[PDB]
Design a protein around this ligand. Structure first.
Ligand SMILES: *Cc1c(COP(=O)(O)O)cnc(C)c1O
Ligand SMILES: *Cc1c(COP(=O)(O)O)cnc(C)c1O
Lengths: 269, 269
């Protein structure tokens, strides 16, 4: 069951530009004890995506009400929101298209997470490299074929997530998560101005690390640099943080950064 | 009205992965006097896209029947076909998803084309540059946000189409068309192994030029190189070929290549 533009609908107009061109954005949020974690960050990230895509909406307070109501019904799980440009326009043009579509739905919280939390994550280098385009970088938009292909190659391994580089060879992210690595007291994360999704949990963690005694640096780094880390941690709104036992035959022995972030993200704070 | 998986439907399951991730491909074909032009090239391009996307279908003869029937009804116009992975799968994974969705529809032939044919096309350099990813290059897939943004920037000019470069600065294509340029007897077109859509009309034209006395070269070229041409021509299944009067304040004086290709593409051959 989905709530589309305010009422229950199982299907959507075929002409919707989400269906035709992926013309839109989305978020996935954690629901715990009836409430959306990080609710204002999720509204803000959707607002930001729509602005960069020129999708003008004024339904924000209604979308927020709807997210709260579905979260209270589901009680524990995942809430997914999609916003698209709507129908219309000639060819790719956005002229005369709209008004925007909003789609919400909720599911129970997935099993495998717990398993992964308690066993640790293995990473495998993806052969699929992300294109670089600052016009789309950072946004959680609907054009996610690159991630479908990354996931598909990942499944041919014994790895739980992927280490993903861009077309220039710079370490950018995972398949559906962001990446931090630590050497000593310095904690590194890729800059996402050319590719990648600037996740809600990534921003939360940067905030934490910024205020913490760790030093936090956003970099452009080669896979060889990243592999010399003492520790790797991955994150997304739902995990929210997971420890990395290895990326290939290179192993990581420490969990100190993980141990520090997990309690503050789980609440979250 | 759309024909979806064999029967008339106005709407599509919201969970369809076209809607969620743009997970699919499409074609747009010309209909003249009741028949699809270049019908087998359109089937072949869809087959090729689905193969590279790991979307397995065995409905091809039925899709071909359906395309013919809609073309006969519409008599003159445009036929659009979308194929998506279908619904299902956890997150981005394609495991347990499917079976594939096929969507067809037809519209009348658009007005402005004729106008553009008889007046000539003006091109404007796009500020939006295509990411490079050989895993998706060439395929007419549904992830077309880059083209929505290109179109949007184009509309802020007096240009009818865009000259589009990739992230390395190489001339790749237009917004919804492919690009040829001529210097002397040598005719150039960008190689589309890193970005771009390898259009049906582009392949037709390469076939023609290959057999012709012109010399045809697929290159990696800078915008400065391309701007020293004596002539530019753009193409897609629907135009099918258009002459270029200018790209900025640089003008083109000849139409010899256009004059040669237009009658053989209009039939088509
Ligand atoms: C959603 C997503 C993330 C993480 O985003 P969060 O907002 O923290 O959930 C990271 N990478 C990709 C490719 C994503 O789709
Ligand atoms: C569809 C399209 C073309 C031209 O494809 P044809 O098969 O000749 O119509 C060129 N570029 C883009 C970006 C396209 O979407």
């Amino acid at each position: 069951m989905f709530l589309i533009n305010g009422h229950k609908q199982e299907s959507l107009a075929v002409s919707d530009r989400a269906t035709q061109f992926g013309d839109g954005c989305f978020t996935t949020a954690r629901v715990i004890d009836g409430k959306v974690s990080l609710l204002s960050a999720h509204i803000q990230r959707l607002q930001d995506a729509c602005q960069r895509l020129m999708i003008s909406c004024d339904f924000w307070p209604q979308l927020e009400q709807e997210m709260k109501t579905l979260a209270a019904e589901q009680q524990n799980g995942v809430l997914k929101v999609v916003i698209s440009r709507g129908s219309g326009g000639r060819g790719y043009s956005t002229l005369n298209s709209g008004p925007a579509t909003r789609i919400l739905s909720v599911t129970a919280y997935p099993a495998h997470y717990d398993r992964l939390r308690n066993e640790g994550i293995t990473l495998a280098l993806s052969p699929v490299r992300l294109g670089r385009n600052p016009h789309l970088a950072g946004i959680k938009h609907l054009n996610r074929l690159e991630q479908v292909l990354i996931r598909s190659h990942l499944e041919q391994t014994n790895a739980d997530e992927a280490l993903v580089l861009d077309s220039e060879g710079w370490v950018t992210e995972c398949c559906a998560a962001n990446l931090f690595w630590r050497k000593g007291n310095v904690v590194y994360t890729p800059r996402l101005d050319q590719a990648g999704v600037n996740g809600i949990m990534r921003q939360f963690c940067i905030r934490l690390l910024a205020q913490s005694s760790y030093q936090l640096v956003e970099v452009q780094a080669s896979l060889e640099e990243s592999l010399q880390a003492d520790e790797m941690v991955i994150c997304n709104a739902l995990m929210p943080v997971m420890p990395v036992c290895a990326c290939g035959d290179v192993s990581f022995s420490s969990a100190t950064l993980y141990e520090y972030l997990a309690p503050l993200c789980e609440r979250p704070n």
